[PDB]
Symmetry: C6
Subunit: 213 residues, 6 copies
Amino acid sequence: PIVNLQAGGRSWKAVESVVFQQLQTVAMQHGLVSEDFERQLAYYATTWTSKDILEVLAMMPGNRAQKELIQGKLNEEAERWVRQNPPGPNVLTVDQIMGVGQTNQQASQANMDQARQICLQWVITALRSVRHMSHRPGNPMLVKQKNTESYEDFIARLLEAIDAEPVTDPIKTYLKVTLSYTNASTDCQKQMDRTLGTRVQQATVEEKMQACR
Amino acid sequence: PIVNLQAGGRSWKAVESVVFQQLQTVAMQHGLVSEDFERQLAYYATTWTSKDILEVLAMMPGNRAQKELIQGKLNEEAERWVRQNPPGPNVLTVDQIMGVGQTNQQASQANMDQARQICLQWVITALRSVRHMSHRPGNPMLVKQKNTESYEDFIARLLEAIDAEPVTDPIKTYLKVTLSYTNASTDCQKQMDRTLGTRVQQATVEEKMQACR
Amino acid sequence: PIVNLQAGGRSWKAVESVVFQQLQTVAMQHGLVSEDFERQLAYYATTWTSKDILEVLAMMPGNRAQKELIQGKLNEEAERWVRQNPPGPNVLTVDQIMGVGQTNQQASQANMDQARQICLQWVITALRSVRHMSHRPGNPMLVKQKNTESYEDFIARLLEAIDAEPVTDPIKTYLKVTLSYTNASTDCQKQMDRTLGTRVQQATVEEKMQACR
Amino acid sequence: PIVNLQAGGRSWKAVESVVFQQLQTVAMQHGLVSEDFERQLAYYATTWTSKDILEVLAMMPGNRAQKELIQGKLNEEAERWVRQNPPGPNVLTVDQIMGVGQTNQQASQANMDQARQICLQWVITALRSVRHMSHRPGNPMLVKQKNTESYEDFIARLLEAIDAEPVTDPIKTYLKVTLSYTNASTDCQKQMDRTLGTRVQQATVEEKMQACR
Amino acid sequence: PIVNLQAGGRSWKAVESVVFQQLQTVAMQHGLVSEDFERQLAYYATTWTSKDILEVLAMMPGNRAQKELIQGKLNEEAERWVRQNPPGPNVLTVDQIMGVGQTNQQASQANMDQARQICLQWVITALRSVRHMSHRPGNPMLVKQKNTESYEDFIARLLEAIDAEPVTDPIKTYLKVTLSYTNASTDCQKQMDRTLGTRVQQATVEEKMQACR
Amino acid sequence: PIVNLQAGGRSWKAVESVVFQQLQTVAMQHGLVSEDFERQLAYYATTWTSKDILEVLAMMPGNRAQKELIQGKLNEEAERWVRQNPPGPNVLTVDQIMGVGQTNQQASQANMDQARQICLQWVITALRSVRHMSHRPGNPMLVKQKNTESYEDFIARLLEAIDAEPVTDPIKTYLKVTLSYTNASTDCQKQMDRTLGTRVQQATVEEKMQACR
């Protein structure tokens, strides 16, 4: 974590042992590629140096292969960054962004603020990508209410499946509303279909949600 | 959390890991829509930026659908805010209030103090509204002393049922006093009815409370 | 908690999460009307704003009816305060004392110091009063050494019973000394009666205490 | 706890919740009259105000009668203090020493430093005195090595028994050395008596201690 | 831990009890020679004095012989340092680097910053070396998918085996890709060999990883 | 703990409740005379006043006799200090060193820095001496590989036995290397004796250590 000195100079601080242990238990119960770890790491890594965004991630508990997969995806982000940003006189280098050969004080500098911001972004994209590798194709379509599962529970699973997929907002909204009625059990889809006629199939996320419960 | 610098400038701080873990255990035992989480979040979110009122809520443990329901209600609050406050030159935008595209420092500014205040208000209304969706109609009327439940316990349940409903104070008071005698078991309602005659039915919250126990 | 700024201005702070959790476990094991919670809340609520003396109490775990009983007694304190202190030009209002419509900064002001002091006093009186409602009449007189209970234990129970009652010091002392010999088992009251003759009945709290054990 | 302001003025602070919980667990496992609580309270009560030396003691977990016994002994200390120090123009009053009718700030003042020092001293004497009441007469003499208890263990119990008694240093030393050989089991007292002849009975605390084991 | 005084002078601080306990539980579950302890110690030992890099390591829980092995390897590093850096007028001495006969303040000085940096480096090399002693020769080659172990799990074990070996990056990459197909079970190596023909054997770390699962 | 004021004056602080509890659990699991407690106490007692080096030790959990043995040895250190340092005009007194009749502020002074340094040294020597009393003579020689114990484990026990003895470095090195082969089981001592001939008996700590495992 960068510390802003009262003099205005900037020095470094070891990650607060409270925050580190906080992220670890969220990477030990949910996983280091799980969204819960991704959400907590991004909020607390705002002050983290490019050096502390990589070292802490490595220390976090996870399967050895997953760290290979994450650094593998992370290397994919770096090569992409070099291609999108051609070598330039003051342009950052993958090493500068990956905190290579920098003392913590030099990696906590303002010039490494862009570097720390760029680094954290690559890790989140890789984890979303490592997470996508776990997801099989068409998870939402396969999900249904087997054994007449609670309409609430079924919608929770369907929401997880759309959230799993990286489809963009305009298409994320299409899927949630469309799949909820289609994959619903005949008992409540049928009663709602008569209850709200065409409209229930029209909009299903909220109006259909309250009716089935 | 906004931090007020001695210089008078304002900077940001990651939510204290003590407070975050505090709210989470109250959102993991009672629920993230439960009143206990709503009370603790409001007290500790006074300093929270518009950005930290949304990110922390998302990190808190809850059913996936409930977060959809909360953001669904939260979007209802935003559209209502735009209609009630027409677009204006210095008027806040739903994005400004929802901390969109703002760095933590820029979201911890005084101009975002109104934005953070407006944001927190929407979340509480949604949760009360998400909570109301769980409540069926006429919960207090259905509540009674089945199996001669302790008059204390029965009043506790009845108080919870009025608190559940969003009826206004003048009508919240009507219900508590009225339903306590009506739904009471014959044994103690009858003995009190003879004991205090007309007055016991007149006022039931305190005088009837001590007598039945 | 009010924080006294070095500049001399006064700002507010969310109740330290260490102290809050401390009072809660004493309101979850002993009760929120129990003396143990009352003692810890008064010591730590010295800096608490009128707003933080009410919000934290509400968050503390307790039966729903008990909070009704506490706010019921608290309203009794407020109406009494208005009658004893007639409306005046600079006189505090029940709202000012109950931290109504005040921002935390404005409720942490010196002018609200009297208000915070007055508020805390009402809550303690109500809890003592809520606690008295639980106590049946003449608890000390009924208490005896059934099954020849340890004279120490019996005196502990008798001391609890006098402490329960709100009798004033001059009469609190009368009861402890008087009831200890009268309610004592025949075996040790008789042996002490011969051992110290008239004096043992004269003074019973300390001289009789050591002899029976 | 008094806090020394940088300006040189002195203000008050609620007992650190870390220290309070520390003393409580030592008053919940060993007892509030036990030496372990007495040792920890004295070390941490150096900064405690006369008001915080009494309130925290009351909050600590203990049998109700024991608090009566401690305040009983504490009142014995106060009456003795008045007799030894006759009423004087600037002489402290039992109330001033017992933090009566003083705001925490006024009880954290330098003039209350003597008062806080005098108060803490009375509580320790009472607890030693409350502890003595538990001790029966001649505990060390009765202690022996029943069933050939480890000479180490037997000396531990004997040391506890002399420590229990308030005999002065010149007589505390007499007892430890004298009782260790006398109460020892015949097997090791006899072998040592031949082994070191007259000297072993002469000095028994260290030379006899190593030999029996 | 060195503390940088506002005056610019430098003083010492006892290792934060939060960080110490953090490293110990990682040296009590994984081992004091395990990579997990090595990663956490290096990140938190940035501020540690040469004196605190040795004392804390000794306090950490481990087999007695392992500390002999670590100090044995540590002495190997020191003799090597003397040979590589011949005695010089301002050149550091193994004692200066090993914080011998220095007060904490004098060991927290800027001149001991190089000494603290040099010390920490030796300990990590020894632990990697102590860890290598545990590793038998050719661990990766022996590792295979016995009982058709998950291709993911098998790659995790193989990655651990290459990480175990101190082979340099150019040869670390050769091994991971080469051994994954060779040691794979016939069922998935065969199906992949037909699926991707020559290329699957060409590159096996990522393309073969997703296909077998 | 002494606190160095910004003004340059020095005041006292109650031992951080985090560090105290840290040492206690190491004096409750390993013992208050065990090396683990001795190592942690020395590192954290650098700032401790002469008064806080004695009071905290007494509070730490231990057998009553052991504290007698430790203060017994501590008195041995004091009498030795008086003899080695004859009474002098500015020479420290055992009382000054043992923090007798000094207020914490006066015991936290620079003139008591030598006194605090001298005090801590005596306690460590006594504990090493109290620990030696537990050790019987010739512990390393008696230690062997009974039931063919792991050569690693056997060397761990032998290293503990030499560490137990206070023999000086030149003779500590002689013992470890000499006893490891002599007390080894015939199976691995014999195979090593043929494997490395005369040299294996020559040096046994490292070369023989790797070979037997």
